[PDB]
């Protein structure tokens, strides 16, 4: 159907591979989810580059099932805020349940989300649960959720790389209202919302620790 071509690869000497892999780990390790974000301007060129980076993700059968909806308009951001705070309040009060609520205590999150106003840019990542071809026939988006999550991962990496912060959020039950507000089609579903900017001078994060290597990696012999 399409042509297959020689793959062109950039290879480093081993020592540099070692250093690169270490530095990249050290860089990503400094990524923390930040819930206090400055209103300070960020260059749209950088925002575009991080979205381009996300778009380089692999996807099931090459379907690229993602839409990155960018919101900079203050009225639109605030509209987004109110929807989310409204739904999250019901979430904390009742819909998540006691266990989940208890599970969140360590993070000190609640239903008020100031960052949705203060962050200069919001990125809403929509997955396309199926697509359409040019003739208007439906196309299957194999593993679209995983594919879009991988893209989101790349996006997260690209933000850290560029010196920006965010917090990956899942505004449970806000999806349908957000879809309508933002004029997205019925086959798109909000996956995560990323408020983007610099951290506030007064930003804090929970003193969480990541697992040791021997807690996430298992090597298997015979």
Ligand X SMILES: Cc1cc2nc3c(=O)[nH]c(=O)nc-3n(C[C@H](O)[C@H](O)[C@H](O)COP(=O)(O)O)c2cc1C
Ligand Y SMILES: N[C@@H](Cc1ccc(O)c(I)c1)C(=O)O
User: Residues in the site for ligand X, rule: CB under 6 A?
Assistant: 32-33, 35, 58-62, 107, 109, 143, 146-147, 150, 167-170, 205, 208
| Rounded CA separation 23/126 (Å) | 31
Phi-psi region of 143 (alpha: psi -120 to 50; beta: other; left: phi over 0): left
Find the helix or strand (DSSP H, E) in which 152 lies: helix 144-161
Distances (CA, A) of 89 to 81, 101, 171, 221: 12, 12, 11, 50
| Rounded CA separation 177/124 (Å) | 13
Task: Tell whether residue 131 is a contact of ligand Y (CB under 6 A).
Answer: no
Site stretch for a second copy (CB under 8 A), options 2-10, 86-94, 112-120: 2-10
Site stretch for ligand Y (CB under 6 A), options 20-28, 66-74, 168-176, 213-221: 168-176
Task: Tell whether residue 129 is a contact of a second copy (CB under 8 A).
Answer: no
Site stretch for a second copy (CB under 8 A), options 53-61, 85-93, 110-118: 53-61
Task: Tell whether residue 146 is a contact of ligand Y (CB under 6 A).
Answer: no
x/- binding map, residues 16-55, to ligand Y, per CB under 6 A?
----------------------------------------
């Amino acid at each position: 159907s399409v042509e297959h071509i020689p793959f062109s690869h950039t290879r480093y000497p081993e020592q540099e591979m070692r250093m690169r892999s270490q530095e990249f780990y050290e860089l990503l390790n400094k990524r923390r989810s930040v819930r206090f974000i400055s209103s300070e301007h960020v260059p749209m060129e950088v925002i575009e580059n991080v979205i381009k980076a996300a778009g380089t993700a692999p996807s099931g059968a090459h379907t690229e099932p993602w839409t990155f909806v960018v919101v900079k308009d203050p009225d639109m951001k605030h509209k987004i805020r109110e929807i989310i705070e409204e739904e999250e309040e019901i979430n904390y009060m009742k819909r998540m349940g006691k266990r989940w609520v208890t599970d969140l205590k360590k993070l000190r999150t609640n239903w008020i989300k100031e960052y949705l106003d203060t962050a200069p840019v919001l990125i809403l990542i929509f997955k396309q649960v199926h697509g359409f071809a040019a003739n208007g026939k439906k196309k299957v988006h194999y593993y679209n959720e995983i594919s879009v999550s991988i893209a989101a991962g790349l996006l997260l990496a690209a933000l850290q790389n560029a010196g920006l912060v965010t917090v990956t959020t899942t505004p449970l039950n806000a999806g349908p209202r957000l879809r309508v507000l933002l004029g997205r089609p019925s086959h798109e579903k909000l996956l995560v919302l990323l408020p983007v900017g610099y951290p506030s001078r007064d930003a804090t994060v929970p003193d969480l620790k990541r697992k040791a290597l021997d807690q996430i990696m298992v090597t298997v012999h015979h």
